[PDB]
DNA sequence: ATTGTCATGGAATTTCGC
DNA sequence: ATTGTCATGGAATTTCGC
């Protein structure tokens, strides 16, 4: 027994102390200080809150449904490769509106410009892209080509078509499509294109694919005022309003110019880190997010042990299957209560 | 090669009810085409009622119409509650 | 990489007849385009009623 | 004719200005700065910028696809009520799993307190709702009841039940779910609670929703540490863990305690407001968002004007249709160029 | 005026008749007359109809501002013409490119000759070997003079 | 003729012991 | 054993005229 300036309250037995928290969060589920003031109705000890934490990490009924509430930190911007064909990033698009009996559209931007480039098939198979590809590594070879990790993608034949180009295939982490960084980008262009032009008409859009990788690849980008063609090749072709102002030089000297223009670009800015950020340690639990999480089931699984940190934003975990699967850190949480 | 059958899922429902029981292989036959026969007059009515409709989509809603058809009387009772346990089992599960 | 335990789906529904099994006699046997997720749960559900009420 | 520093340009009769420009943004569509850089190969006069503006605004092929890179302002934290069963905070969840045959669970939150009420039906009828809320009118009358525009509380039959009561119904904005405050977050709370029970088992949750608003109506407010019991009534019920702490008082004088608990109560604090906000004003062209928004078509309307603004994140704009479309400014996008 | 520019005076060359590989009878071989690219984009027949549906792919990329080669079937039309004015491209019609024309009418002839249909599947492959080819006028590959970078990997050399 | 929100865990803050 | 991004319009900024 113990008196309080808000009334009496209860003292209880050492080995009253786990039965007595545990019939009370279970009341409601809650963490840490709505189960706390529960037993501020009935009972007060010296250290409450290190019974509440004693209790939040058995309960495995409330880690994986309760979301974090600590952001990830500052986003990385990785540099840009310094040629073009280094590194190609590719996602389909679609299921559009048909024509022609297309409805799937490959994607395959340049990382070093934004050149975009456009392979129409009709269905997004293995050999789909395959022969799609045939095309454009008629032009050059890739060291690198990043994608995300698709049905298409990820199968075990595109890969041995893969390796006899000198392909390196990169994917992204799962369910993450913010690392494809420019494909996603583009795709708010072509579909900021062809939306312009088919307004007021059927979508035919299978007449206008070489309209969009020739009205795009000469937009100059507004914070680098080049085209994608000077970038990519060093000159105009014949586009109407093409520059006259490389005519007053040397072919034979204006390539090592070139790679000083390539070299002066803008880089973009990192955010500021927020308060609430959260970095992760190699050995800390952490919680992956549940992939496809169906109705009235756990957002999150049983926690997880990093065993690698790669960079600041990915991270290999050891999932309950026995998985190796690197996430991101924009998929997982600290578990609670440590 | 290949013939697919229902010979297994039998044993799976002859020892429900009757556990202490074998079936012979010529009777195996008649509760085998007993299914694939009772199966197409199922779905090849389920299959006129997307026609009917003017649907593309046999739905669970589509099978039981065909089954208060051609179960008669005391059957039609049964076999229309007999799915829609083993269907809200089956939605409330995955 | 491995993946989760499969659970089919004849024991997702408490019955012995297949679902999936019956879900591939609804759309190779022409009888419409568009066959539903709980349309082979039903019908392996009357298949195992009447193949209990014989062999009762 | 003309010299520059960086080549020979030139310079256009009066007479081909309208020309020489839509003919260069016609070819990528482009707003202000890609558009410019165009001419910048061939030509230059003084005020090129003055005719790329004076194109755009015709240019109705690029006002209704590209989106606005100006946020809304700060958001409005409208008050708290005075008293309970003023504003209920009505929204149907579900497709749910099922049980029972049921689906669909109307909640209805207090806008006082968070007391939530749970009425499942089978279908989001008018009639469904109707009698869920005769066992909730049973307790008391609300004066006004929030929702969204629902299926099925917009229906011309649900407002004359809620015109005998004296209900006055309120509608959210359309297409903003942001605007129904509480029960947003309270099925938050549901699809938290019946999500922690419902852990290993098949989801019946007919069960229990007796115990959800019993369980949530007795989780303390962490940063009011209050029961929704307590806000509501004034002392608990027969529940685990119930104070004694009002024990020790006259329950005919701490009503009018209770009228001072309830006005100490922590309001939220509104965000700072970003550099690039923008106000609505009465004239201004707006545009508003493209409902459900098709593939490969405009995502917003051809343009608009504000006839009142009646908060600053509320305003009537006068659509294409003849419509009196009340929407928020988290729909509108400012007209680009005026 | 100034010295020679890429993209400026294509010179399309045909080599046939292949056996068929999916109806493709012509290889449109395609060289620049400055940086001597290899755009190979075939075709099934010699027309106005079935070699601008490959020229398509080719002025997506890049658009030559005089189109010029031998007469032929494609070459004579007014429908190519009119194709042509909206295009924007000077038409003639109704150094590199001939060492370019050596691989041509000697070797690539009796290399894609002897296969019915196993020429398309080299393409891609025949092709990134004519776009590294030195010319001692220009002492650069045709790869190093249009990107304005060198070779990538040692596939792509 | 309408408007987010609020549970939740580091982490900073205050109490306060003597 | 991987990581946003980048077109775009007020709006602030710099040029610069004499």
Redesign the interface.
């Known amino acids: 027994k113990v008196s309080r300036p808000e009334g009496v309250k209860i003292i209880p037995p050492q080995s009253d102390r786990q039965k007595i928290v545990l019939q009370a969060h279970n009341l409601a589920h809650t963490g840490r200080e709505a189960t706390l003031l529960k037993i501020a109705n009935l009972y007060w000890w010296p250290n409450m809150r290190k019974d509440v934490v004693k209790q939040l990490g058995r309960c495995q009924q409330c880690l994986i449904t309760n979301a974090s509430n600590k952001a990830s930190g500052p986003i990385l911007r990785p540099d840009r490769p310094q040629k073009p064909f280094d590194k190609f990033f590719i996602d389909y698009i679609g299921p559009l509106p048909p024509s022609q009996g297309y409805l799937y559209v490959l994607v395959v931007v340049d990382g070093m410009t934004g050149f975009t480039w456009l392979y129409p098939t009709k269905a997004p198979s293995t050999s789909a892209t395959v022969k799609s590809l045939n095309v454009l590594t008629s032009i050059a070879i890739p060291k690198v080509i990043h994608s995300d990790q698709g049905a298409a993608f990820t199968s075990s034949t595109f890969a041995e078509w893969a390796k006899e180009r000198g392909i390196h295939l990169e994917f992204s982490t799962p369910y993450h499509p913010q690392s494809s960084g420019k494909v996603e980008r583009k795709n708010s262009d072509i579909k900021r294109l062809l939306t312009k032009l088919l307004v007021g008409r059927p979508t035919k859009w299978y007449d206008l694919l070489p309209v969009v990788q020739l009205a795009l690849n000469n937009t100059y980008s507004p914070v680098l005022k080049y085209t994608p063609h000077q970038l990519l090749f060093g000159i105009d072709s014949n586009t109407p309003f093409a520059n006259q102002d490389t005519l007053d030089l040397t072919r034979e000297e204006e390539l090592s110019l070139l790679q000083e223009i390539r070299t002066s670009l803008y880089h973009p800015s990192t955010p500021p880190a927020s308060s609430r950020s959260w970095s992760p340690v190699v050995g800390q639990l952490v919680q992956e997010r549940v992939a496809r999480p169906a109705s009235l089931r756990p957002r999150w699984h049983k926690p997880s042990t990093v065993l690698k940190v790669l960079n600041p934003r990915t991270v290999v975990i050891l999932d309950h299957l026995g998985n190796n699967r690197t996430v991101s850190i924009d998929n997982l949480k600290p578990t609670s209560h440590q | 090669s290949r013939k697919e059958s229902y010979s297994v899922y039998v044993y799976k429902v002859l020892k429900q009810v009757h556990p202490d029981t074998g079936i012979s292989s010529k009777a195996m036959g008649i509760m085998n085409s007993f299914v694939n026969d009772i199966f197409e007059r199922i779905a090849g009515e389920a299959s006129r009622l997307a026609h009917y409709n003017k649907r593309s989509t046999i739905t669970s809603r589509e099978i039981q119409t065909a089954v208060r058809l051609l179960l008669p009387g005391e059957l039609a009772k049964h076999a229309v509650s007999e799915g829609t346990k083993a269907v809200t089992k089956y939605t409330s599960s995955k | ?4 335990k499969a659970k089919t ?1 004849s024991s ?7 679902v999936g ?2 879900h591939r ?2 759309r190779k ?8 997720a ?2 082979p ?16």
């Open positions: 990489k491995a993946r989760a789906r997702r529904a408490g019955l012995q007849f297949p099994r019956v006699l609804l046997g022409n009888y419409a385009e568009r066959v539903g709980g349309a749960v039903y019908l392996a559900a009357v298949l195992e009623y009447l193949t209990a009420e014989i062999l009762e």
